[model samples]
Target: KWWKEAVAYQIYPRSFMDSNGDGIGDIQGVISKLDYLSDLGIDVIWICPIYQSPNDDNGYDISDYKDIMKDFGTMEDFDELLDEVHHRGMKLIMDLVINHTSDEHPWFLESRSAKENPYRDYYIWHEGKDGKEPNNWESIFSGSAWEFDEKTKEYYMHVFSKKQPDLNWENEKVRHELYEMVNWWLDKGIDGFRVDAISHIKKVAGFPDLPNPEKLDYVPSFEGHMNRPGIQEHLKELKEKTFAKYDIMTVGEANGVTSDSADEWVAEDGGNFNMIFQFEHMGLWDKPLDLIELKTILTNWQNGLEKINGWNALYLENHDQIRSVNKFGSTAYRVESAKCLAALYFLMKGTPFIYQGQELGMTNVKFDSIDDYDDVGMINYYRIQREKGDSHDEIMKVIWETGRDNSRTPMQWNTEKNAGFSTGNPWMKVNPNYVDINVEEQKSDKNSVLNFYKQLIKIRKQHDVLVYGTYKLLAEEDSAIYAYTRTLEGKTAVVICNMSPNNQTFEFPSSFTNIEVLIHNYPLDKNETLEQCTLHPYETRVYLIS
Candidate 1:
């Protein structure tokens, strides 16, 4: 079970490294960081999109599927990076954005050029119904998922930006071509793919209208067009045709997938992907952290997946998310919170993913104005809120609290200008705390966040109980503490964390005697009674009991 025991690291290339003073990261820059990544004990690396694009939606709106972005580098540079990645005993997986392509793509260009082109059907196009959009549906970026093409005298569907035209998956030719494109990449000797926006590929028949709360307007109801029938058939066909033949990993960036349905996507026997990136926890943003809800969610998935023979992919942060330290941990106890959160997830029953800069205990960045934000989702949502009469101060606070730009900031390598990310200006302003919380400073300190993460990874790899053992969540109703155990055969590992910013005491069974302290954020009392153990603020401790 390579995937189940693996520790994955995700890199957003644009923010990872910058060479040639271009103020943007390139493949060569990533190549220069292979030793750094290998030293972190990463098994696989998932790089975000770097394909040739018009830069409309960053690299997501790809113009050329096979070529690298000019800012990133050439195909030759990518080949070299892939080679170097394997040479260091690490596997490299890339983003596969097949949901839509830039309207600038040749297929979409020809599809929009004329009414009778062979590629016209490559995209979803329909005649305007009663002199309006095909249906009252909203695009993901803003309003109207359907874009009108004057030359074809019809509306084409685009789930995201109008610049991105959705491919008609119903078209056999389209499916065949996409499958061929996937095989083309796998043949190049790379690992596998992180399928992007996978749920939006299936559109319901007849492009039905959605119920809008604001009457006579379009509605942005994602449920109106997601997880349609035949999606499994398509994915299974893809798995049998391409993925099954290679020793690779496939994790789909999906929404609306649940434990009941996850078996079809990640079961050990024959599922589409190794696992799907579910949003049960990430959706709890802007709300208070509830340990009860967290336990319920985990227990449901853990029990359900164990019965169904499926696996989980555990993560707290990613390129599109704010740091978990800000989400689950507090600013005053940032280091302890980061380590505790790491123990909370890494010691669970799944593969642990480390987002770049997360090992350094990165915190969210603050912005005085929306002008400083670069994310399309953040900027567009800000305008949408403003239209509903939200103030600038209000909107800026929300963005500062949980915007993607927080994670998009340059990697703080050292306490230098631009945080040693680039010799020139960075793509995004570096977080001001970089001087106090940079990688160079932490890698040297014994008690720093980086070394703690290294220790956590090393511990997980050496203990089979942390990898394949069954999970048991205790203290389920305790708001100030989270406790769990992983047991296999006769070996057991106990994980306990005081999640609050205050000292707390927890009672354990008397059978928890003669335990060995595996790891702890603070000093451990190995000889203390299990019935009365006092935990410091944001404290985390793990123990092994026989």
Candidate 2:
């Protein structure tokens, strides 16, 4: 399948490019970048939501499933963009937000009208407890998960923002409608989907209260609302009904997925998806790197799928993560840090995904005040923390470490006004350092982060061992050095990365004599022996063994 051997790139359309001076990137903007993305050796691109929405939670709250947002251009523009992507031998995957819909959706509109309304069952509606919420469960966005409906005189469940009402999957008709809608898109010849928040689709039989950890009058999160019995059944049937009929791929957004449960969803057969986006590392929120936790989580997943033939979507950064360099590596050695992460994740056994602008080694951004933030989730987080008396300095520091807005800044294109992302004022400010770090500046530099990513991606595409090989962690417990070997059939490869800021000396395994350096982040002596070497700070070296 194209998905297995290919490297995927994610593009947040609203910040990717700007055409017609709209200041918000549109489908047309993405169309303008197909050649750039293809030139970067990207085989597939995952686009965030562009459907008609109220922008309540950005495009995740879809008001209309069948149409495009007004700011994103018409359906014809999407068709043109699709054609352009396919023309370049690359595929495009759209975000599938089936877990919920904008409260303004026609289905939600009628569902909120009255108790007996046919559409009322389209959403999860329940009578409240003594005029309070039906349960103590808190939404993922940091508030009550249930919203009281005035006219209907009941509380509707919303896993995210109240504006995004969760669809009642318990209703057979709802499942049919979702499957039919998916087919409608597949019929259009788009590659497939990146299913959004899929694990949240299945809830406990009845809305229930979870134990409150914060004791702030509501439960912090509902742990039992995911992976309920019928979730897998629904996904399997959906795959049989839609995905099976097309030569497409799906990387599901699994909110609560863990290595323990990964096989049930992504096993070679009898599974629910091709792969899933796991958040173990991303959930670390970019604190100082914890080598123990990193090795444990990564190795657990690596060994967990070794026999099942299941796969993972390997990534260090994404729309919801701060830049990898800013979080996983040191900004002082930005280029080397970025290249080290590329080597670490790309050389692993899975489909490698790179977030937009990461190729240029983008780092986190710091806003002057809370008012400068625009991510709805981040704003809600700030509000919730402030109500608990957290100081701005305390909150902002944490926000700078993990805020989704850090990645949402308009892509830094050049030194031009608005970072060449817009001719007018951009919806969000471009990073101030765009002048020193941008595509224009890195494109011609042979040793630039962009070129390093290009080289890494090309090597992965050319070698099968990097893709299907078994993963084995070497120097198993080392805190500063990460060494791993991958072997497939008779081919073998080894990757070593020094995550520390100081030089590290290590003796290679006695078995690695005569190892050939396939790629490295910096220059190395062609005549040097791999048997023993001193690695520079943040250095990454990949070797092929015969």
Candidate 3:
């Protein structure tokens, strides 16, 4: 229940800071930022994976569940980081990546050694079908999902990269191994976990090939693999065994779960998780931005979850996403737009998560060459686009707008060398606009996006109505305006946002009166009336009615 009212901040450890100047972020780097995070007014900190890993997909591909990554530091360093976070009156949640592990993991290595090995059943292995893969299933990254192993004369399945092998949940031993690991972290005093790629834990009954309309070498198997029928049993067992024993929060990265079926995953009595990160809203990046569709999706989630007494995990940016200012707002009006977007979601009925660098209104980055990127998925997509005969400029254009590297850039602490991220060269390039957008500059500027976020968090904390009120969408047909009201008892809060670069006029209903400004991106006029007001581009205003 504490998590319901809390403001969560997500830290991508590799880019958050560099304490040792090793061109990589480590536990020590995160330790040094405890005070800064506390000052930001966030209640919970969800750190991306720092476990021992091969870095195939960053830290998503784990090699050891108990040990910390050498790039991140030792196990002792993680313990100290956890202690320091608790010392600041804040909670720390870890990213739990159990869907798969690096192929180099001891379990995977032994499983591939021989057919009779006890660990062979720890992963999914199958004999080839007609000298091809077990089926025509494709990896989420690229290529066939099955990798051939000569020693066993069989192929192993990997939903992600070939270097990361999917775990066989059907094996009772494997299920217990993963559950034990989850308990191990919770035992070490972590607040909770953001379970990664959890919806893909279970596969269909058989290694079935999907119908390929394009006649490609492989086809997507999402319908069969993701959120399959038997996933709930595993999740329920996991909850009853581990999470149900503690008061910790659990938010799953459920990729395939839709708004319509969200209740089954997050209902209080029988659900497996406290909430899930749904992708319906995030999936809008491919096409042009449509305010109407955005409103419909968000409102549906709000109403759907509220009906089931299920909470939402509200976020617009994360490690896998482009910066919110780049994806949803204008970079030219970065300050105002960032604050406007903040007010729009932070006031909604859920726990809000702020990704690293998002507080400074970070924008997307454009690299001269795709080789400069480090994201495994991004690089693979680049190669695929090139093989499909996409022009270099055309590929770069898409990468500039939708690349994950845009969010993976090193944190811009100041305008110093390497953007003050490291003394040596950074693992990834820092955004070149650091000179103007660094945290040091914004920390002192009263009107900076960082300060605006601080104000917004404080407002959310002061007003319980924002947290527990019923949501009602206003001006639903307006193409460029997103307006909504949160009502509880006799207190009501109205949020009106101009989601475009053009000015728009909003006429308030005559029945509503006694409106007092709670917060606004732009300063209000001396005699502005609530009856009708013309909003400037990217302007947003919140009013409290009593």
Candidate 4:
């Protein structure tokens, strides 16, 4: 059951390792790094789209669902990776991106071959309204979700890239074939499947057109998503047919999912998933309407963690996202601030997930232009901002501030060439600061972010109270410091995180007498004693007390 309390690490393999010096990381490279992962206390390695893709959306656009990307490796390499990860006592979670196949995929080819073919119904196809897109809904990749096929004279729904077509989930035949594919991979020894963007699999049956909004009309966020009318019926059936039979661990990229629906999706008796990647906390940023709304959203996460019967796959960064240190902290105290944030999530009551380079506190990549971006989401957004009449500077600033490729940069392993990720020139440029912030420096220092992370995970594995405890928030009226306590198994652990650049002190309540310093982002000097506990600027500490 501790696998339920496991830690998942997302590895973008192309950038993760390189064995043969091909300017891209491959399976053998991952094999070389297995020991590193095991040492880091990783239980799950969620490999993102090593399958053959057009690389249109950074491997999300799969041209062949079963074949490995030539740049990444082969079937033999995959088997090797599986052996290596499993040998390290870690499980591999493959990204199940079956919601769509690349337009170049064989299924899409046959579906678009002729109008009357049996495969035509495999994908969402419709006649356009007045020779434009069928519905006013937009693609998550930032354009009209519908694309016209001159070969078939029909517009196919694509929730992402134009080269990627959304599969028709309502088609029972399609569902049957998908299930077979799932079973095939499961049998191939994949430990679990992390379904990608699952909520968008089904649409409103009629799929009515959305009314155009006035300002920034490129596309609204909520249109054509799962919260539409009829998606749950399809999902319930999908869970019953495909996932329910498998006893293996499963997590979904159930982004739009909510706690109200947790009972149906991931409760012990629920049919869907073990846990899901929910976004109610991740979307806490400046919205069009309110900048003050982040407080309410943070409170929601504090409450969301209180739901024990349900669980969450918690994260602050991933491949398709900006870096967490930049997202959640200021540059003044970037490293310590980030470590503080990491402690906040890891010490919570859920399975903690760490993105590559997050332990070293990597920030968002500074982009020169749209040409520098390889992620299609970033490319599309750049094009989209232009289409909306924003100037080049305006869009560039936003892309710099929020682009997904920010997290996709080459990992900084060392100060050497390509950050020691490859021998030849890397496929992407390395952040020059790798020399200063590389793992070499971190491994030698006790108070480094990397070591702090190891200590945190060690604490999680050692203490049952950290895993199954009721949380109580303390440190009221202190804006920069958030303090809380977790009480379970007859022990109460006090947690404090300084979210600002200035030092802060919190006095222990008089009744909280017995104290022992348990874990900290910074190393303790001898036994930590306190008239009032003082945290260094941007430091976090957790202490066990009776």
Error of 4 at 136 (Å): 1.6
Per-residue alpha-carbon lDDT of model 4 for 480-530, expressed as tens digits? Answer: 777777789668877778777777776764356578777766666555456
Give the C-alpha lDDT of model 3. Answer: 0.88
RMSD of each: 1.9, 1.7, 1.4, 2.6
Full candidate order by TM-score, most accurate first: 3, 2, 1, 4
TM-score per prediction, in order, is 0.96, 0.97, 0.98, 0.94
lDDT of 3 by residue, 1-546 (tens): 789999999999999989987899888998988888999998999999999898988999899999989999998998899888998999999999888899999999999999989999999999999988889997877678899999889999998898999999999999899889999889989999999999999999787889999998788778768988989988999899899999899999998787788777998769999999998989622403688999999999999998899999999999888999888899878888898898888889998999999989999988898888887776776788789898888878887888778899999999999889899889999999999998899999998889989988988899888889899999899998999999988789988899988788889743455767888888787787767888998898888887
Residue pairs in steric clash, candidate 4? 17-25
In order, the Cα lDDT scores of the candidates are: 0.85, 0.86, 0.88, 0.78
Query: Best TM-score goes to which candidate?
Result: 3
The Cα error of candidate 1 at residue 460, in Å, is 0.6
Scored by lDDT, the top model is 3
Question: Can you tell me which runs of candidate 3 are displaced by over 4 Å?
Answer: 284-288, 510-513
Model 4, residue 21: C-alpha shift (Å): 1.9
Backbone clashes, candidate 3: 0
Global lDDT of model 4: 0.78
Error of 1 at 511 (Å): 4.1
Cα lDDT tens digits, model 1, 1-546, are 787788999998988889888778888889988888899899999999999998778899998888889999999999999999999999999999988999999999889999888998999999998999888887766667888887778999988887899988888898898888888999999898999988778887887888777684667757666677668877888788888989898998877787788888888887899888887778622404787888888788888788878888889899777888898889999999999888888889988889999999999988687777787767877887888899988888888787767898988889988888899887788899999998899989988889888888998999899999999888788998999899987789999988888899898633544577788889767777766888998898888888
Task: Give the distance in Å from residue 407's predicted Cα in candidate 3 to where it truly belongs.
Answer: 0.6
Better of 1 and 4 by lDDT: 1
